[PDB]
Amino acid sequence: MALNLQDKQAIVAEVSEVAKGALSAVVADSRGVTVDKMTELRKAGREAGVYMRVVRNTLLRRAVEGTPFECLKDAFVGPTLIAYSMEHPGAAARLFKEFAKANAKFEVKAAAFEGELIPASQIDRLATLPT
Amino acid sequence: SRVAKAPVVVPAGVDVKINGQVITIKGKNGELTRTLNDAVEVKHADNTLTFGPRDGYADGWAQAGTARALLNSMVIGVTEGFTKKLQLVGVGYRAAVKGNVINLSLGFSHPVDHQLPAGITAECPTQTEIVLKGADKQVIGQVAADLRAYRRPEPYKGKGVRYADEVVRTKEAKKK
Amino acid sequence: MKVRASVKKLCRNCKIVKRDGVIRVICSAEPKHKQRQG
Amino acid sequence: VKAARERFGRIVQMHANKREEIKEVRAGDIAAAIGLKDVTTGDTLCDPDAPIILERMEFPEPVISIAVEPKTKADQEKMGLALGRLAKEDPSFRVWTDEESNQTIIAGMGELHLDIIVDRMKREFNVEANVGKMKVEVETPEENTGDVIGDLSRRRGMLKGQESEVTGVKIHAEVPLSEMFGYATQLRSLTKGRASYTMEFL
Amino acid sequence: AKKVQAYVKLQVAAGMANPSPPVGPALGQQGVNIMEFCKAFNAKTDSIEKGLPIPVVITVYADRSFTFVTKTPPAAVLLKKAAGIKSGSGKPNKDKVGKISRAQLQEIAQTKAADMTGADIEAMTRSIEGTARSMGLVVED
RNA sequence: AGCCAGGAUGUUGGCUUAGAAGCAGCCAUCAUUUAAAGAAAGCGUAAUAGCUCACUGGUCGAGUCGGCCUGCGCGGAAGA
């Protein structure tokens, strides 16, 4: 039912969940196994949260129309499917960790663990904050 | 129609010679000539080829699409050539080649020799492999089929000549 | 084949082709689905 | 084995068909005794004191039963003696005129086996005779299950156990007795001559 | 070297580990013998289903041994022995199809959320709730 | 249209509790687990594997899909 009106609506209905929470994820379509990717998206839903939308309506034009209002670099979605997995208690939580650790094993591929960084800042990951 | 509404990307390194409706190409490998149908119009336009409906004919686009496909096949023939692989399931089915006349040993009762047409290089990498190469899709396919028709595969074991990709529909004889 | 005076698609992989005017059913799944004349 | 007395007159040891009479045989020899009117196959000949039994008490079960009738209704004595002698020779080949009606029925182990029996009857004990007319359990390779069951369902055959062992598959089937008539040969061509069965009156 | 690649569903109720004798080992494709027939199921087949349905996987891997992180107490046994009424599908539209209640749901939620889990512990709980409710009849407790 | 692939591990179903097998009988039973889970698609259907009901994401640049009415045609259509 990914029609034009449902797209015009779910573009914002999927921009909102990643624009109020943390970064989301994306998972390609290469090879999901009877155990690996099935039970892995299972444990994804289990630990990550019961709000993540592992579905993918991530057309390049639908993205540029809906999501690009904030963090306008979403229309490069020529790449494969998206398993959108946000995070509740702050940014880069267990969902982001699982996606980034699944891009290399325990799944087909996680499309470089796309993520959504509102800053698009200089070249440094979020690791310069010890105590 | 859709295929006819598309340009043939004729690379640099092959000679294109269109005249009237008779077409001629000269690539690295061979030389290919064929007169298109009267209802087809051709033009080069800077390192490509076009095919459209020459006026006054109903299936102008149909003939143009056929001609586009033929000219692409000729271009890729003279560019990289074609290559048909054939296999021989069946006891003692040799495909010895001498000159350019394959000596098929399918053991009917008698020798069968297949005179190839001009433009087919028929080597036999193994005892039960044929590799017909050359620069014309249609004649290579037609000679490969004239071969395979000697012993079309059977349904019960698959005995006979087959294309390298041909999936045979093997079936069970009967209860007994 | 079958020379039924009414050829129909007996399976899903049957196709209706009209070689030589004669309307034929050719099926690349089951060879018993090969019919001749519409 | 029989607990009786046998005696010797001619001892012959020679090629397949020829017979070279000798005087005595020692241990490790193979010869043919004569007039031995009592010992059946697998029974032990020995001096009055030697082994009561020497193993070998098992041979297969016939698998094919057919009836038979000579050209003239009254040569059935000739035929019965022929098929008592041939049955003595082949312990895997029975004969019993089943007293259901009267019919003299012949149980061998194969179609060609029974052909051999009938032509030996016509040639040696010359009587030209024309042949005529439960919970089954079958083993077979686990590739011919589909056809053997298609064959069993082709016959009025209901089944009992869908159990597969390890070197094959054990099929159990309830089929008529007036039926199957050649189930061994049908099965052998069907199973690549690699199956056994049994049909003993459920 | 993987999990069950030999999916052949022929195993009678869990009183005996994958009972071949009964249904008949038509799934005779099993390479299992008296070496792998008493290794792990014989020693960890007590606290899941003792005389109830707990379907066994067909896992035979190429570590030259048989071992894996086995599933939880099966909901198939949980909702058929936590019921009293051992019925289910087949006679679900005529009479009692077995018992299923919120108490059985809480039981299965706190029990089978160890290894037979899904998109949540509570989500596999809803799994057991479905395996208990879709029986065709439940006691609305 | 053409292309990069994903369907259970409560689930021999709780099942006619002899399963008649993550796709025989069978009732029905999304069964969260979703770019997906039907307890039923052609393969083995009584059963794996490797192509896979269904479904979609990824590609890709202008039309596509089925019906209904209608004209004129096509097969049906073989004899001395």
Swiss-Prot record, chain B:
Cysteine disulfide partners in this protein: none
Keyword Protein biosynthesis: no
GO molecular function: large ribosomal subunit rRNA binding; structural constituent of ribosome
Keyword check for Acetylation: yes
Entry's Gene Ontology BP terms: cytoplasmic translation; response to antibiotic; ribosomal large subunit assembly
Gene Ontology CC annotation, any one: cytosolic large ribosomal subunit
Lineage top rank: taxon: Bacteria
UniProt xrefs under InterPro entries: Ribosomal_uL6-like (IPR000702), Ribosomal_uL6-like_a/b-dom_sf (IPR036789), Ribosomal_uL6_a/b-dom (IPR020040), Ribosomal_uL6_bac-type (IPR019906), Ribosomal_uL6_CS (IPR002358)
Record keywords: Acetylation, Antibiotic resistance, Ribonucleoprotein, Ribosomal protein, RNA-binding, rRNA-binding
Pfam families registered for this protein in UniProt: Ribosomal_L6
PTM-bearing positions, type N6-acetyllysine: K43
PANTHER family: 60S/50S RIBOSOMAL PROTEIN L6/L9, LARGE RIBOSOMAL SUBUNIT PROTEIN UL6M
Family assignment from sequence similarity: Belongs to the universal ribosomal protein uL6 family.
Subunit field text: Part of the 50S ribosomal subunit.
NCBIfam families: L6_bact
Function: This protein binds directly to at least 2 domains of the 23S ribosomal RNA, thus is important in its secondary structure. It is located near the subunit interface in the base of the L7/L12 stalk, and near the tRNA binding site of the peptidyltransferase center. Gentamicin-resistant mutations in this protein affect translation fidelity.
The name this protein goes by in its record: Large ribosomal subunit protein uL6
Lineage per the UniProt record: Bacteria, Pseudomonadati, Pseudomonadota, Gammaproteobacteria, Enterobacterales
Curated annotation (Swiss-Prot), chain C:
GO molecular function: rRNA binding; structural constituent of ribosome
Sorted UniProt keywords: Ribonucleoprotein, Ribosomal protein, RNA-binding, rRNA-binding
SUPFAM superfamilies assigned: Ribosomal protein L36 (SSF57840)
Pfam family, one: Ribosomal_L36
Superkingdom classification of source: Bacteria
Gene Ontology cellular-component annotations: cytoplasm; cytosolic large ribosomal subunit
Gene Ontology process terms (BP): cytoplasmic translation; translation
Keyword Ribonucleoprotein carried by entry: yes
Family: Belongs to the bacterial ribosomal protein bL36 family.
General function of this protein: One of the last ribosomal proteins to be assembled in the 50S subunit, it contacts a number of helices in the 23S rRNA, acting as molecular glue. The simultaneous presence of uL16 and bL36 probably triggers ObgE's GTPase activity and eventual dissociation from the mature 50S ribosomal subunit.
Subunit structure: Part of the 50S ribosomal subunit.
Record protein name field: Large ribosomal subunit protein bL36A
Record lineage: Bacteria, Pseudomonadati, Pseudomonadota, Gammaproteobacteria, Enterobacterales
Gene: rpmJ
UniProtKB/Swiss-Prot annotation, chain E:
InterPro entries: Ribosomal_uL11, Ribosomal_uL11_bac-typ, Ribosomal_uL11_C, Ribosomal_uL11_C_sf, Ribosomal_uL11_CS, Ribosomal_uL11_N, Ribosomal_uL11_N_sf
Residues carrying N,N,N-trimethylalanine: A1
SUPFAM superfamilies from the UniProt entry: Ribosomal L11/L12e N-terminal domain, Ribosomal protein L11, C-terminal domain
Residue numbers of N6,N6,N6-trimethyllysine PTMs: K3, K39
Keywords from the UniProt entry: Methylation, Ribonucleoprotein, Ribosomal protein, RNA-binding, rRNA-binding
GO molecular function (one): rRNA binding
Modification N6-succinyllysine, positions: K71, K80
PANTHER family: 60S RIBOSOMAL PROTEIN L12, LARGE RIBOSOMAL SUBUNIT PROTEIN UL11M
HAMAP family documented for this protein: Ribosomal_uL11
Family: Belongs to the universal ribosomal protein uL11 family.
Assembly: Part of the ribosomal stalk of the 50S ribosomal subunit. Interacts with L10 and the large rRNA to form the base of the stalk. L10 forms an elongated spine to which 2 L12 dimers bind in a sequential fashion forming a pentameric L10(L12)2(L12)2 complex.
Entry function: Forms part of the ribosomal stalk which helps the ribosome interact with GTP-bound translation factors.
Name this polypeptide is given: Large ribosomal subunit protein uL11
Species: Escherichia coli (strain K12)
